[PDB]
Amino acid sequence: AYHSFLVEPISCHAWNKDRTQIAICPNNHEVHIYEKSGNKWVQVHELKEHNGQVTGVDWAPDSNRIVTCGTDRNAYVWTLKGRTWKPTLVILRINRAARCVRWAPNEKKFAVGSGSRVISICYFEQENDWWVCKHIKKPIRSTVLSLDWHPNSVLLAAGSCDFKCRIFSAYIKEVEERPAPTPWGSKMPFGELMFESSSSCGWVHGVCFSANGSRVAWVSHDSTVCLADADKKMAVATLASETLPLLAVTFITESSLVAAGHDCFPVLFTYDSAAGKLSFGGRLDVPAGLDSLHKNSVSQISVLSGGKAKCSQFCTTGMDGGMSIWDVRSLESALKDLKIV
C-alpha cells in the first residue's frame, strides 16, 4: 500500500494518535501535515519555522503536541491553537545539527540527539513557563543518530556514529519519580550509563525497545541487526545480513523485529529467547527498475496500530518520497512461510 507524497526524500514522519494525520518533512525547512479524505491525501497544515532541514519529528498522542528538530540546531514544540499550529522555541544548548527526536511515553519530556555528541533531555517548568533541558554527554563520542524510550519513560536507548548502542537514564525527578527497578538495573540516576554494545563497527542507524522494554534491538551499518536481552544478563545476539545496511527497526511483538534500509524493502527478524539467537525470516515486500514498493532507501519505520506488543499495521517512509502502509496479518496470508515470533 504505497503512496507518493513527492519524488524527493521524506526526511522523517510522525503520526497522530488516531493515525488520521501524518507529519512529514520533504527535504525541507518545513513540515507538511497530510490528512486522509476517502482514499486521497490532502495537505491540511504547513509548519514553517525551522531555518534548517527538519531531521526529526515526533507527535505526542494524548497532549497532541508536535516536536521537531533541525540542522539549524533548534527544536520547536508545536501546539494547536484552534486552526493553527504555533511553535515554541526550545533551547537545546548545542552548536551542531539536531539529528533526531522522540517524545517520552509519559509525554512530560522529549529527547534530541545531535552532532554535538550529546542527547538533550527537555522538559517544561510550569513555574517559569518554558522549556529547559539537561545534557547526557559521556561517553558519547559522535553524532547521535537514533533514539527510543523505554516504556517506563526513564530509560533511553541511543545509536550513534561511534558505533555504539547505549541505554541511558533520562530521569528528571522534577516531572516524575523514582523509576521502578528494571532488569536493566536498580540505580537509575540521570544520564547513568545502563548498557552499551561492544562492537566497534557500523554507525547505529536505528534502535528500538520492546513492548515491555526488557529487550533492545538496533541496526548498524555493518549490515547486522542485534538484540540485547535484559533477562539474560544483557547478552547480545547478532545476525549478519547478506544484504545492504538497515536504517530503521521496530519490534512487532516481543520477539519479532521488522526492518528496512538500503535494500529498499522491509524484512522480518525473529528472536529465539531460548537459544538466544536472531534469525532472518523476512522480506515482506514480495511482488525505475526495482521489484520493491519504495524506489529508494527506506529510512523510517513506525508502528501504526497494535503497539510493539502485537503490531497489526506498520508504516515506512523513505528517500524516494514514498509512504507505505503494511498490514501484518495481510502479509501472513500472502506468504505461507511467514512466522511472527
Partner 1 sequence: MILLEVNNRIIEETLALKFENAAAGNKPEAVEVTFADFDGVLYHISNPNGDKTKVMVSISLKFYKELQAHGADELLKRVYGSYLVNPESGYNVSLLYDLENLPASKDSIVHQAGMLKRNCFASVFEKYFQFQEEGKEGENRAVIHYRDDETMYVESKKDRVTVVFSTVFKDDDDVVIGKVFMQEFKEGRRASHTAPQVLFSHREPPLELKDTDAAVGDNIGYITFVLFPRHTNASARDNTINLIHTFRDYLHYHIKCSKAYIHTRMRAKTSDFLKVLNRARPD
Partner 2 sequence: TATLRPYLSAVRATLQAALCLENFSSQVVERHNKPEVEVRSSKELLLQPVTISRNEKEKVLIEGSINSVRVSIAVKQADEIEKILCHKFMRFMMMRAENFFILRRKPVEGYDISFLITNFHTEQMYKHKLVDFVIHFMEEIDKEISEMKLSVNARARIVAEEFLKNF
Partner 3 sequence: ARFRKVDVDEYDENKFVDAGPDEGEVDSCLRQGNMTAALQAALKNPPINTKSQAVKDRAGSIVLKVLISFKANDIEKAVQSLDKNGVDLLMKYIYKGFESPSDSSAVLLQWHEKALAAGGVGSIVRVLTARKTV
What residues line the site for partner 3 (CB under 8 A)?
117, 141-142, 162-163, 200-202, 220-224, 240-245
Q: After what residue numbers is the chain broken, C–N > 2.5 angstroms?
A: 287
Question: Which residue has 526492518 as its cell numbers?
Answer: 259
Confirm or reject binding of residue 289 to partner 2 (CB under 8 A): yes
Cα-Cα-Cα-Cα dihedral sign, residues 187, 190, 75, 52: negative
Residues linked to residue 103 through DSSP beta bridges, in sequence order: 110
Confirm or reject binding of residue 245 to partner 2 (CB under 8 A): yes
d(CA 225, CA 40): 36
What's the closest the beta carbon of residue 32 comes to partner 2, in angstroms?
Answer: 17
Confirm or reject binding of residue 58 to partner 1 (CB under 8 A): no
Cα-Cα-Cα-Cα dihedral sign, residues 326, 329, 334, 337: positive
> Which CB, 210 or 296, lies closer to partner 3?
296
What's the closest the beta carbon of residue 98 comes to partner 3, in angstroms?
Answer: 17
Which one of 18, 233, 288, 336 is in contact with partner 2 (CB under 8 A)?
A: 288
> Which CB, 27 or 313, lies closer to partner 1?
27
Confirm or reject binding of residue 295 to partner 1 (CB under 8 A): yes
Q: How many residues interact with partner 2 (rule CB under 8 A)? A: 36
Residue 9's binding partner among partner 3, partner 1, partner 2, none (Cβ under 5 to 8 angstroms by kind) is: partner 2
Confirm or reject binding of residue 229 to partner 1 (CB under 8 A): no
Q: How does DSSP assign 156-187, residue by residue?
A: EEEEETTTEEEEEE---TTSS-S---BTTBS-
Q: Which of 77, 88, 73 is nearest to 14 (CA)?
A: 77
> Which CB, 73 or 215, lies closer to partner 3?
73
What's the closest the beta carbon of residue 259 comes to partner 1, in angstroms?
Answer: 24
What's the closest the beta carbon of residue 237 comes to partner 2, in angstroms?
Answer: 24
What residues from 31 to 70 belong to the interface with partner 2 (CB under 8 A)? 52-53, 55
Q: Which of 268, 270, 271, 298 is nearest to 284 (CA)?
A: 268
Confirm or reject binding of residue 320 to partner 1 (CB under 8 A): yes
Which one of 178, 242, 288, 289 is in contact with partner 1 (CB under 8 A)?
A: 288
d(CA 227, CA 126): 39
Q: Is 230 helix (H, G, I), strand (E, B) or coil?
A: helix
8 Å CB contact between 163 and 202: yes
Q: Which of 182, 276, 272 is nearest to 232 (CA)?
A: 276
Confirm or reject binding of residue 289 to partner 1 (CB under 8 A): no
> Which CB, 49 or 320, lies closer to partner 1?
320
Residue 242's binding partner among partner 3, partner 1, partner 2, none (Cβ under 5 to 8 angstroms by kind) is: partner 3
Q: How far apart are the first and last CA of the chain?
A: 24
**Contact positions vs partner 1 (CB under 8 A):** 7, 288, 295, 320
